[PDB]
Design an enzyme around this catalytic site. Structure first.
Site, PDB file in Angstrom:
ATOM      1  N   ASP A  34      -4.397  -0.192   3.982  1.00 36.69           N
ATOM      2  CA  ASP A  34      -3.283   0.832   3.815  1.00 36.69           C
ATOM      3  C   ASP A  34      -2.937   0.779   2.518  1.00 36.69           C
ATOM      4  O   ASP A  34      -3.746   0.542   1.529  1.00 36.69           O
ATOM      5  CB  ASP A  34      -1.955   0.292   4.818  1.00 36.69           C
ATOM      6  CG  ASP A  34      -1.707  -0.979   4.309  1.00 36.69           C
ATOM      7  OD1 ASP A  34      -1.860  -1.303   3.043  1.00 36.69           O
ATOM      8  OD2 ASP A  34      -0.841  -1.752   5.044  1.00 36.69           O
ATOM      9  N   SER A  35      -1.802   1.730   1.869  1.00 34.10           N
ATOM     10  CA  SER A  35      -1.733   1.800   0.666  1.00 34.10           C
ATOM     11  C   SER A  35      -1.569   0.681   0.080  1.00 34.10           C
ATOM     12  O   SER A  35      -1.907   0.574  -1.297  1.00 34.10           O
ATOM     13  CB  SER A  35      -0.554   2.762   0.473  1.00 34.10           C
ATOM     14  OG  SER A  35       0.813   2.441   1.149  1.00 34.10           O
TER      15      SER A  35
END
Ligand code: NA
Ligand SMILES: [Zn+2]
Ligand SMILES: [Zn+2]
Ligand SMILES: [Zn+2]
Ligand SMILES: [Zn+2]
Ligand SMILES: [Zn+2]
Ligand SMILES: [Zn+2]
Ligand SMILES: [Zn+2]
Length: 75
Positions: A34-35
């Protein structure tokens, strides 16, 4: 080896088996990053290899292969 160290960094962060950490694997699409994971991966590559990955270069780090190729030439 450089490759083994890169695999441990990625496996530790994403919780993926090293057998799936191949050169063409995309951190996001294939390894489920994810980010926050991406930011932490960059931070770890810098710390473990004693180098700096400027924002510009960081954006180009999309696959395991990018990091390996980048590090092999830089360090
Ligand atoms: Na570890
Ligand atoms: Zn650790
Ligand atoms: Zn394994
Ligand atoms: Zn993508
Ligand atoms: Zn894919
Ligand atoms: Zn940095
Ligand atoms: Zn650069
Ligand atoms: Zn790439």
């Amino acid at each position: 080896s450089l490759e083994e160290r890169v695999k441990e960094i990625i496996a530790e962060q994403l919780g993926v088996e090293k057998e799936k950490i191949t050169p063409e694997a995309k951190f996001v699409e294939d390894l489920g990053a994810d980010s926050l994971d991406v930011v932490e991966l960059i931070m770890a590559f810098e710390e473990e290899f004693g180098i700096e990955i400027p924002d510009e270069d960081a954006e180009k780090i999309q696959t395991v292969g990018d990091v390996i190729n980048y590090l092999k030439e830089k360090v």
